[PDB]
Scaffold this active site. Structure first.
Site, short mmCIF file in Angstrom:
data_model
loop_
_atom_site.label_atom_id
_atom_site.label_comp_id
_atom_site.label_asym_id
_atom_site.label_seq_id
_atom_site.Cartn_x
_atom_site.Cartn_y
_atom_site.Cartn_z
N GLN A 2 45.89 -25.19 -30.45
CA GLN A 2 47.37 -26.20 -30.42
C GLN A 2 46.42 -26.58 -28.62
O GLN A 2 46.36 -26.24 -27.68
CB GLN A 2 48.18 -26.58 -29.89
CG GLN A 2 49.73 -27.72 -29.48
CD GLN A 2 50.60 -27.30 -29.30
OE1 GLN A 2 50.87 -27.92 -30.49
NE2 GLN A 2 51.74 -26.82 -28.44
N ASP A 32 56.07 -50.97 -32.93
CA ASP A 32 54.92 -50.67 -32.78
C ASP A 32 53.63 -51.10 -34.42
O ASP A 32 54.90 -51.85 -34.98
CB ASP A 32 54.19 -49.20 -32.62
CG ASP A 32 52.79 -48.92 -31.67
OD1 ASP A 32 52.07 -49.52 -32.57
OD2 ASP A 32 53.22 -48.71 -30.21
N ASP A 41 50.18 -32.84 -37.49
CA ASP A 41 51.34 -32.54 -36.38
C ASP A 41 52.00 -33.46 -35.73
O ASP A 41 52.86 -33.74 -34.37
CB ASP A 41 49.79 -33.11 -35.12
CG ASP A 41 50.06 -31.69 -34.01
OD1 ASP A 41 50.95 -31.39 -34.00
OD2 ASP A 41 49.40 -32.41 -32.63
N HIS A 64 47.69 -47.70 -33.58
CA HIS A 64 48.19 -47.66 -32.49
C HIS A 64 49.22 -46.99 -32.60
O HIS A 64 49.31 -46.26 -31.98
CB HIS A 64 48.35 -49.20 -32.12
CG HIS A 64 48.46 -49.56 -30.75
ND1 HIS A 64 49.89 -49.19 -30.68
CD2 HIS A 64 47.67 -48.94 -29.32
CE1 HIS A 64 50.22 -49.49 -29.28
NE2 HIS A 64 48.91 -49.71 -28.40
N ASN A 77 53.71 -26.25 -31.87
CA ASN A 77 52.67 -25.96 -33.38
C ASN A 77 51.31 -24.95 -32.95
O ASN A 77 50.61 -25.20 -32.07
CB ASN A 77 52.87 -26.31 -34.66
CG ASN A 77 52.22 -27.05 -34.86
OD1 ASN A 77 51.17 -28.07 -33.92
ND2 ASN A 77 52.13 -28.81 -35.75
N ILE A 79 48.22 -26.63 -33.41
CA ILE A 79 47.46 -27.58 -34.21
C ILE A 79 47.77 -28.89 -33.47
O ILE A 79 48.57 -29.13 -33.02
CB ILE A 79 47.67 -27.59 -35.39
CG1 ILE A 79 48.80 -28.70 -35.65
CG2 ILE A 79 47.85 -27.21 -36.50
CD1 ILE A 79 48.99 -29.57 -36.74
N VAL A 81 47.23 -31.74 -30.87
CA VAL A 81 47.79 -31.99 -29.26
C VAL A 81 49.25 -32.13 -29.38
O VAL A 81 50.11 -31.53 -30.60
CB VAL A 81 47.50 -33.33 -29.59
CG1 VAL A 81 45.99 -33.40 -29.13
CG2 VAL A 81 48.46 -33.84 -29.90
N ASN A 155 47.42 -55.15 -19.76
CA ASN A 155 46.28 -55.05 -19.12
C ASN A 155 45.69 -56.40 -19.32
O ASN A 155 44.47 -56.53 -18.77
CB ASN A 155 45.37 -54.32 -20.45
CG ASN A 155 46.65 -53.12 -21.11
OD1 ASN A 155 46.97 -52.03 -20.51
ND2 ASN A 155 46.04 -52.53 -22.94
N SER A 221 49.70 -49.08 -23.08
CA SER A 221 50.35 -48.55 -24.77
C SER A 221 50.19 -47.28 -24.72
O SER A 221 51.38 -46.68 -25.19
CB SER A 221 49.36 -48.74 -25.56
OG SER A 221 49.65 -49.98 -26.16
CA LIG Z 1 50.38 -29.33 -31.99
#
Ligand SMILES: [Ca+2]
Ligand code: NA
Lengths: 281, 64
Positions: A2, A32, A41, A64, A77, A79, A81, A155, A221
């Site tokens: 990760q 969203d 993930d 998005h 975990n 993996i 991010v 934005n 965002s």
């Molecule tokens: Ca992860």
């Protein structure tokens, strides 16, 4: 292995993780374009779609909502991010069609669903240049009901001395969030005005994308879910704190940056926010 | 770099697309009804065109 995206570290989320707090039992609605629940993930706990012809909130044909959700709550975990609040209960409240637009009534219905389903936090990485009375009433009702409501500031960048914060961020009851980069510089696109409340990382933010992918996006965002995730961390450490208290704790412990017209109160610091006594660093 | 087209407000969506593609040939143009809500990601390659019910431009087009 990760990876921890720089923005999660920059807001000091790892200090809460080391204390043992990760947003467990906190219910966060990502209002969203949906969330891809098949992503390994992410864990999606529930949700609903307010888009008449696109009834599955767990299918994100835009991409998005899935990216926003990974910043809130990508799993802890080996993996991908790591999210700001990796144990949060994540709800996909789909109010945008695949084409990336939503009617005001769909966003309102999503806010109403969140209230009716006892969400603790709402994130809205969305906006428009005009208000409506019905939109203001829905966000005001959520906040009156105890929900922490966080939204992208917009934005629109600068426009002389005019505010360019869009709705619903521009309503007093909603925490409007602008974007900084990894050096704490305001991103050129980030909206400005007296309604800008706090800043969070919103440049080159790595997160989850549909079909088991990852990628870096830019925008207010991306900044908003650092703050919604930080609100979940704080509630997991202080489950009795009201939304009023969670909001003040984030506002009162930012790292001040420049003028408040461009930076609001500065960069959130969730480590400082989640202590009992608050001051700026 | 030209990144906003305030002179296009009140023109047809057709003329706006043509002009934007002259200035920015690789632009990804997306046409949406004015008064809708959109996600807040910032994409340098994209230009949203918000139209009124007559299909005329109702908001200053800009990159993002
Ligand atoms: Ca992860
Ligand atoms: Na606000």
């Amino acid at each position: 292995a990760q990876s921890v995206p720089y923005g999660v570290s920059q807001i000091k989320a790892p200090a809460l993780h080391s204390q043992g707090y990760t947003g467990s039992n906190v219910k966060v609605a990502v209002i969203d374009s949906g969330i891809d629940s098949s992503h390994p993930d992410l864990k999606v706990a529930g949700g609903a779609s307010m888009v008449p012809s696109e009834t599955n909130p767990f299918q994100d044909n835009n991409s998005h909502g899935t990216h926003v959700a990974g910043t809130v709550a990508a799993l802890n975990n080996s993996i991908g991010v790591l999210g700001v609040a990796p144990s949060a209960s994540l709800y996909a409240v789909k109010v945008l069609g695949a084409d990336g637009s939503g009617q005001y009534s769909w966003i309102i219905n999503g806010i109403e669903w969140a209230i009716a389903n006892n969400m603790d936090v709402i994130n809205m990485s969305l906006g428009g240049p005009s208000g409506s009375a019905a939109l203001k009433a829905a966000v005001d009702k959520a906040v009156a009901s105890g929900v922490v409501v966080v939204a992208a500031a917009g934005n629109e960048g600068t426009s002389g001395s005019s505010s360019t914060v869009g709705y619903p961020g521009k309503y007093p009851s909603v925490i409007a969030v602008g974007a900084v980069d990894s050096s704490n510089q305001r991103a050129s696109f980030s909206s400005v005005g007296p309604e800008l409340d706090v800043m969070a990382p919103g440049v080159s933010i790595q997160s989850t994308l549909p079909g088991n992918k990852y990628g870096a996006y830019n925008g207010t965002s991306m900044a908003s879910p650092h703050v919604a995730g930080a609100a979940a961390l704080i509630l997991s450490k202080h489950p009795n704190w009201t939304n009023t208290q969670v909001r003040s704790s984030l506002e009162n412990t930012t790292t001040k940056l420049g003028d408040s017209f461009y930076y609001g109160k500065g960069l959130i610091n969730v480590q400082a926010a989640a202590q009992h006594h608050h001051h700026h660093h | 770099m030209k990144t906003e087209w305030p002179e296009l407000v009140g023109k047809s969506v057709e003329e706006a697309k043509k002009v934007i593609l002259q200035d920015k040939p690789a632009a990804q143009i997306i046409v949406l009804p004015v008064g809708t809500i959109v996600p807040m990601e910032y994409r340098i390659d994209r230009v949203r065109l918000f139209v009124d019910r007559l299909d005329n431009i109702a908001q200053v087009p800009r990159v993002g």
